[model samples]
Target: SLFELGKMILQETGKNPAKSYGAYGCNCGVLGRGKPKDATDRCCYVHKCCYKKLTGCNPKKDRYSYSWKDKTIVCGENNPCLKELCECDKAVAICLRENLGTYNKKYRYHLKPFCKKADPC
Candidate 1:
């Protein structure tokens, strides 16, 4: 019910009804903010956001561990990166790491052009 309720609410705001829902944190609702082209970017983006929140470090900065050192977990993130690559906006790339997951991995192979258009690595 909460899932459908969230979908209905977003639809009312003219947002896409397609998303995975569960909690109400930054990572709770799949990749809705950027319309990430496909699932992969979305997954990576969400996970990156959450990671940024958990640790002050970025992707290449350190070899990150899946679970954060802190005991806080954000929602909607879905641990997106399965595999990886980077070289773009320091801020953007910093927030977007590579990984794998439900709404995170397979969906990326469909969006190189989209990422390229955004202008980065």
Candidate 2:
């Protein structure tokens, strides 16, 4: 899956793998208010928009709809949707990493940590 693949890429890039993945906003996963509390959260906001724009993957319906078979598939030339999603995840991962310092000092103490991380391609 693109999300898992993005985590793998994060591990290889020397960032903590745990920071990848989250909901549509400031909170990690399904935890916080769906608003951009910081730059890291803003990254997630952009990520969701990217998915909506490029793949028409609605977060409300498609975020957790993937099955085991879908998980088995990987990013490749043949899977354009998956490829775009993968790129989105990767870009967010990089974005989150870039903004980690701000997140930790300002937000992590009062708010939850990030759960979804990806890139926009």
Candidate 3:
């Protein structure tokens, strides 16, 4: 998948710098044209990236978590509300959202091992 490529890019370029959120953990959640008609009732944009702070830790985010239906995904596994990779994450999230149906709305996100683990690298 292109995500692996992105991870590779991050690794090669050292943009993430090899450390939890800084390294392999900062990957984006893949979003499709929403889900099939008979798909699950998932939010779709749950772990996706929105770039805006959506959690209590984030002073900028107004909500608890990002919503794909209305907003973008918050890719930071460590901090959902932090503005870490908004632009890049938006690009990936937007691509998924557009490919998905209008009803599909936003993308979802999950914590990354690089960020969650004691050692991201």
Candidate 4:
């Protein structure tokens, strides 16, 4: 799949930098507080909703234990549930990239107080 291939290339090139967000804003790994700080964060918010709507994956049990790196493997599998998860993430990635110019600088790396962990959406 192109998604898998692209992800591999990005991983190898180290061009995909991590994204930042507020503790209560749209974030990556580990669920956020359901509050969006900007349009970019809103992408993640929608993603969380998508997960709950499509897959019965629980944020507290599933998302909290899931790591960003795990997506490379999990999303690559043939399971429909995992595929939906990847779709949700991919949608948010596109959303964030499109809104990069408008999102708060606090969500960018090397800008302010560093985020402990980063995610695509």
Candidate 5:
């Protein structure tokens, strides 16, 4: 019901409806709150403003691409990480640590997109 509405809003706005980690719905697992919950996923934030140009959304973000090369454009506004992350435009520095056979924490980041296609956030 509500998710259907979220999906509808997505379509009307010209975004690929399912091109997100979360589906369009209440339980669409991003973190912060929004119509479908999908909007809260970091990538959706960029797509909604920079690509989709959803009216009434943050239009200033239209200048950047969804990649490391575009980080500087949005850095002043989107820099939520530590100072070191922003140093030398290196937001691309960190990621899911590689090759840990029996690491300490529980995790699964396969849900995330590849580095070339996704935002570092």
Candidate 6:
């Protein structure tokens, strides 16, 4: 599985690399690369390194639309980061986004703390 492979990569990508996986050009897996306490400051690592893919949901939020642009890290990173973070299997990972709660900025479907994290549940 891509994500499973990503988990392995993230576990081995070391604490931090010059650039995250997305910055390079792969989506094997994503690494938050920082403490959960930071959100806006997030750096998404792709499968390997460099080629940041950016994170952005379809502007229209229409998944079925053919024009739907793949979620990007450099572009719509906010949502994509959330998807990755939320997708994490840890409560600590989910609550860490609150580190940006006071900012009160809406970034599509990845802002604010959910009553309970349910991304990969």
lDDT of each: 0.31, 0.51, 0.30, 0.47, 0.27, 0.26
RMSD of each candidate relative to the true structure: 14.1, 8.0, 16.1, 8.9, 14.3, 15.4
| Per-residue alpha-carbon lDDT of candidate 2 for residues 13-77, written as tens digits (9 for 90 to 100) | 35554444433245334343345667876766666666665654433333322222443323343
Clashing pairs in 5: none
The model with the greater TM-score, 3 or 4, is 4
Model 4 weakest lDDT span, ten residues long: 58-67
Model 3, 58-109: lDDT tens digits are: 3223223222333434343344333333333444434433433432212123
Name the candidate that leads on lDDT. 2
Candidate 2's TM-score reads 0.52
Give the per-residue lDDT digits (tens) of candidate 1, residues 14-85. 333233222112223332233354443544345445344443334434332222124321122233331121
lDDT of 2: 0.51
For each candidate, how many residue pairs have backbone atoms clashing (under 3 Å)? 11, 14, 25, 0, 0, 24
Candidate 3, run of 10 with poorest lDDT: 35-44
Instruction: Name the candidate, 3 or 6, with the larger lDDT value.
Output: 3
Residue 117 error, candidate 5, Å: 26
Predicted candidate 2, C-alpha RMSD: 8.0
Off by over 4 Å in 3: 1-43, 46-56, 59-81, 85-92, 101-121
Order the candidates by lDDT, highest first — what do you get?
A: 2, 4, 1, 3, 5, 6
| Leading candidate by TM-score | 2
TM-score of each: 0.25, 0.52, 0.19, 0.49, 0.19, 0.18
| Displacement of the residue 33 alpha carbon in candidate 6, Å | 24
Query: Which candidate order results from sorting by TM-score in descending order?
Result: 2, 4, 1, 3, 5, 6
TM-score of 4: 0.49
